[model samples]
Target: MQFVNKQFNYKDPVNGVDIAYIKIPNVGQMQPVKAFKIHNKIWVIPERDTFTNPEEGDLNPPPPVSYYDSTYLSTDNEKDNYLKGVTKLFERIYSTDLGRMLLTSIVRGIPFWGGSTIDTELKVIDTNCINVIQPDGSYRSEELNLVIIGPSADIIQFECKSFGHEVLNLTRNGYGSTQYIRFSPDFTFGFEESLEVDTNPLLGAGKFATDPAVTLAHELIHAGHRLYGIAINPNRVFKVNTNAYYEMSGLEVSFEELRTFGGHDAKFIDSLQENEFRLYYYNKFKDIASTLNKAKSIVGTTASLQYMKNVFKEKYLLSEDTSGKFSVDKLKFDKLYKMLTEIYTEDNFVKFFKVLNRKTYLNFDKAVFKINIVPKVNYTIYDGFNLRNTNLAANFNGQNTEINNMNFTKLKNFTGL
Candidate 1:
């Protein structure tokens, strides 16, 4: 079950074409379709649904043809960042005419047992129907599923090594026993607890990702590899690799997919980027950057970071002006924000995603590192324009600041940064 990065064989059921692929955890499977790598790109070949009936009485007739879901279920909490991520994911998918066309080809089956799932509820589920912990021991995984009155959304999170993590909680059903949901670096999102800047300073240092929307895209990209493969009809799954040859995880491809997924995906992304959907998200990126920059100017200057802290503390202790205390903290916050924010562009933007696809797609063997993390963005500060925030606070005082400063400091140690 655990193929890791090894290449394997599969015959495309739709057209009866024999093809080869590399096994990717959570991304590829062996039943109806196989999520594997060939020519550097991930592909899923439709083998028809295998479910007889998880339900009783009813025969539960599977879909006669390839199928999928275009809509998503809203979360119980409308404001959940995961929901926000889903929105962004769908938006990116629907951003172009071709992107939409691609969706139909990769649609999940009725029971949705394979390369497709779009769950609204927040529990993690992977390629296997259940994440079994041991020899013949199956955990519904869905047992952890908590639906608040409404229903399911068909999204996927995949089975991961239970390194005592991503959840007994969570265990990869493949070969070896594993812990936590393993994610491609690009596909990673900190857990909700860590996402809270007030509680975690990961975002402050930019050591880990915090954006739900973009992170979701990385998850989808992994799905995209499988979906595109499942979308295959006879031998026409891609405009690139049909009779593609392999060389050592190196499948020789024509344009970009020349077996390394290098140029193969840019071409695929080119198909998705047509909607200027990149523009929409980039705009959101702009708003945050502007705010951070303004905050930086408001707080920047000074004798030194130390001098500024002293100025505010001096006023607070002597003059006893409580309001003055916020100014110094706000200054500190603005500086931290400046450190985190960077100037990224449209090409730089898409390029990052493409690289994410490659690293996760190619390096998945030994380098496919995973973390079960979370997210939730916050805003505030009162009185002056000084944008120093307690959340933005980071410290260098070894033992001293590490104790008092919860977020940035604790985050520093937590991530080994």
Candidate 2:
């Protein structure tokens, strides 16, 4: 049930449903379809120690100490043993597009049976009846009852057969399972499920099959974010003791919605809190560059690094009033930019740029920017900005300014500087 990256998640409310299908050509015709339901609320399972967090009716609830598991009903019925059977069926037929499609449909609703499944019968109820004509000039007409269920608690029932198993087991080939409502209002649930397909594809079903559980987990989190309306503004930055380099995390991604607005500062701040180092580096440089560009728009500075520094401070680092306290330090900005540029290098930009470019195909048009993070020889070198304040926020002692001296050599030597 572990999963790889590349999850299809929705952090915002998704009211309608989405259907996916791919057309087959030449040879025997192949047409596969899958369905998913999207609700308006964020669905966060309410448990702290629970690793996977119990959903509405998970098949395997925690011990008695875990009250959340009480929500699901327990059963050991054979006919209703759809969880194991479905997982096996999925494993066997996952190569086909049909298998992949159905697997997605079922898991999108896993929270329904997080620790105990009161019943799976309602989960796969049949919907409407339809017919299909193949691209190979063939036609078949029969009642097509597809399984359907939802957070709305609707049932989608249907009947079909494929191989020797019951669910879709029609052929002599041992490639199918019983295709019916074996379990009713009581039973256990599983991580994998099945759909019927005629041809057995050789290559494979892709990454979805390898780690089905986490795939659903990541998505369910997104669903929870949407339903709860939890927002993390980007301007606040906090430090964490664990995984200092990992820049992204569930909480930050949960609040990814903030990036849609004009608040990259706040976004990077949140990214920093999550320790998403790469993203932090990327967004940091880009933000400073953006401020510089804005400054240039008002007081046209030449498009050079020196100009970026001077104009940037003039706009953001200066005292609030002529007689006010102090000016922001250049040494700090230089080191931040230097570190970010070092981390978000040419190689990183290529990968990041491709992702940003792909958004265009999905109809997401937005300005794109980047940073480059390259390595240095010395790690202990400190930017004059941070070097001056080894005491952190203690009142600055007049003679203590010596501590703030910039040391690029020191930074280059530090392992993670």
Candidate 3:
């Protein structure tokens, strides 16, 4: 509902992206300023001249446009509206050049959820962090908590926090069964607002780079891991006690029940699962062109892109395309496909856990007691099968098609293993 017609240019090195500052001209006693441009063909708005136009009768002007639109928060109870927004966000991304190419690889061969789809439940509840006295003499505080639940195996829950507020850690019993993801409103409200001096300081790029969409996507990926057998334990309590715990490894190690299992397999699976995460981040990070276009599509401002960049970096840690030599081509989707194929192959299927077992058993002596240490021989599949097998490409093709055809709608519904 707002429009500005002035312009300037400033490239932000901190975010590792370029900027085209566009603004509106003056009126009445103030003369309308001329437009200008910088590196690109587009005209840029000067920071000094840029100002918001007052709505007809209003005496004071509104604030300048921030990156993302906060109006989505105006009606907190509008779940249908929020869901529509999320779907539209994905639809917009999927339609992009990068989106199309990335999805081709995703739909063609990626084993995102370890070949299974889980259900997801969205709940907006009160955060019980504060207290207020009621007329009846009882105290109450209203806080909203969003919970994304999967099968009994997976869960993600968190809330948006005020800037500089210390997030109170909640006690969790299970290891891999649950993960907590929180968002800072500083960045959510406006990416640049968090940068200004405040009582609650932003934590480097990590803090400023969080938003609902990106945070939700990140947690969904984590929930998807549960379906991939990452949290499968002997008793199935679903705890992530260590990286290479034996209870979760399907490989029948010599320990029977005594063998010490390392959580390495989980880590490897995590890295493999993150392939999608990286793809999402790689395409969206600090991309000025795509950002601006997406903003308009989402009925938002350029800040939407900035928030996307921030949330993605916070989840993934690494900055996008900083080296200037990054792209999906370099991502070697082929390599990932090859690795996944090798993992799912009939002969190497159980052998997947077998490799992790050997890795864990080698270092078990230090963790396990001397008497408990079992004399075990390490096994290597590399000696038997070549990494460059002739059937590698063929083996992957069949499974890729299998995964691509399954119902993504049902699979993504629950977001759990």
Candidate 2 lDDT by residue in tens digits, 347-366: 22223212111110001111
Off by over 4 Å in 2: 1-211, 231-417
Alpha-carbon TM-score of each model against the true structure: 0.23, 0.16, 0.20
Candidates by TM-score, descending order: 1, 3, 2
lDDT of 1 by residue, 1-417 (tens): 111133232222222222322122342332322222221112222211122112221212334111122232222232133222232333443443433433332232011111112221111224323222222332222111110011112112221112122421111111112111212211222222122432222223233223222333333332332221111112222343322222332433222121113332334434453234323323322332232222211222313433433332331111213543222133433332221111111222234322111222211111111221122222111100111354333321211222322222111122212
Candidate 2: give its CA RMSD in angstroms. 28.6
RMSD of every prediction:
26.1, 28.6, 26.1
Q: For model 2, what is the alpha-carbon lDDT of residue 361?
A: 8
lDDT of each: 0.24, 0.23, 0.23
Count the clashes in each prediction. 41, 68, 35
Better of 2 and 3 by TM-score: 3
Distance from true position, residue 268, model 3, in Å? 14
Scored by TM-score, the top model is: 1
Q: Which ten residues in a row have the lowest lDDT in candidate 3?
A: 366-375
